[PDB]
Design a protein around this ligand. Sequence first.
Ligand code: AMP
Ligand code: AMP
Lengths: 300, 298
Amino acid sequence: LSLLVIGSLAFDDIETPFGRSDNTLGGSSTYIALSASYFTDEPIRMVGVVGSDFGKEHFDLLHAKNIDTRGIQVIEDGKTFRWAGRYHYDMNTRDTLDTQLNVFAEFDPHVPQYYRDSKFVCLGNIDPELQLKVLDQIDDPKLVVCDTMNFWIEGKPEELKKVLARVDVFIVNDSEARLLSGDPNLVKTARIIREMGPKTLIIKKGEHGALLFTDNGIFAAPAFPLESIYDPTGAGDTFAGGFIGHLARCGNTSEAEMRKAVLYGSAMASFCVEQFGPYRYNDLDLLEVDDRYQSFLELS
Amino acid sequence: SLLVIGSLAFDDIETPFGRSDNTLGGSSTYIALSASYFTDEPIRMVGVVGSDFGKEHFDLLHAKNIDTRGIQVIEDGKTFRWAGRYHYDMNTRDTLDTQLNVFAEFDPHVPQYYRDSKFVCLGNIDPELQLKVLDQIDDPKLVVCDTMNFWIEGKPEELKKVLARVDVFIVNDSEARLLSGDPNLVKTARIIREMGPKTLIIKKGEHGALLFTDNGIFAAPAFPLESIYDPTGAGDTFAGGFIGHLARCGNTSEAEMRKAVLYGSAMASFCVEQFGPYRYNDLDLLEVDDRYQSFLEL
Ligand SMILES: Nc1ncnc2c1ncn2[C@@H]1O[C@H](COP(=O)(O)O)[C@@H](O)[C@H]1O
Ligand SMILES: Nc1ncnc2c1ncn2[C@@H]1O[C@H](COP(=O)(O)O)[C@@H](O)[C@H]1O
């Protein structure tokens, strides 16, 4: 039930109408790994790259969740990926103010030999060409999950479609989905997107619920009524982490398991949004996670 | 991942303030219900009940995701029965009656699909039965066990056979002294550990617990103001919280065991609030987490 996580590792300058957090630890793989760690018994594997500015306090955070960082390269004198985002009163949508690929621009995604036998692969948000280069290095994956971002949907359409043709599960939010389909109807959008390759598609409408589209039909995961949203950053990636984490834990990829997996993902995302950055995970415990899952189950 | 054995029964419980007859009980029941609060996969149960063990009881276990395929049902038999009486100290008790019934000639059979269990809890029951079950587990990572004066006095030799093969042994202070023959709990711990158990936990009713290992003694203070109405099942719900937490995290280090002791104490403190295991009908995970935090701080 080994799990390998790929994605960005970065520092974010986050702004909402109520407050801000600069130089915040972030990146899609950070959120995915921290969330998934609540499901695996063995160390989560990470492949990525950071600069010399990536302090050891950040490495200690990951190691505290028993995350294996041997696959993370540190570029001497290089700079860590940076991102700036701004939210508004709807506390869901956001503007990307700045994006500096930095070390990820010239990244050579080498997956160490001891990671090539990974069974569950999560191709987190990052350049589709890198996502593909990593996938090509995994010998026999049981399940490939992937998510992207408007940046790549608009910047590298063709490359993205190449990766979409080789993934089992594609996770997107409703904005990205409509951008990819060119039609506002989510049902038609799902069809258009699934025809690009992904057998399973999950459309997460912010913290307003998630839709699971498979050959067996549609599953609507309810929203948590009074969720306290303070910072949406990382929500979609923590969702992906709980989703693949659950599947990696039970090792079964059936329909029923994917539905429960969506519920776990929603539960993890509901905790993520409670504070700036990934810090709600500092003290979040299993009893709390189990309790939140039950709420979502009951609502579904 | 977690397999539980022990008694399944109906208890006639009496205290100076009230009584509860034909109450669902048994060590297996208390351990399993408590442990379910910690595991995310069905707890496995091996045991036996009579034709008088109604659907309502199986439904209660099933409501907590407990797998009961390992429980046998004797169509012309009666479920294990016990009668106990508590006093004003609301801790010690007299066993007024014990009817092994179906557990008398019970040949424990662990179905094939339980054989790979990693965490095994040999709950209070005839030591001969506890051994027979353990002998059927392929390669367990941790074996926990508790007993009772009934067995300590009745089958000491058979019990000692079980103890030579368990990782963690859980007893209350009365059982501990009875086993050691000396009132000093520190000396008692050394004598009991010499019987085999590398880890010993002496739970003093609801007055705190002591964890003895090669690294020393850990004291889990008591919750000074807990509402005790029925102590029945306390020690077993303690064992359940203990092995349940470990089963879920998969780690059996000293550090996790001290935390597991705190979780067990939390579960026990809720169990005593009502007759039988019924406080668990409405108990939710956040209440448990809060109770745990209090024990942690103490
Ligand atoms: N182009 C990009 N590629 C990879 N990660 C990004 C990009 N832009 C922003 N991010 C990161 O993605 C995170 C938020 O993801 P999320 O809210 O789950 O969509 C932030 O912590 C950023 O570091
Ligand atoms: N000899 C025995 N073997 C197994 N279980 C017993 C025995 N005597 C009483 N019990 C059960 O153990 C429970 C209480 O355990 P406890 O207070 O945790 O020691 C009751 O619900 C009884 O059904």
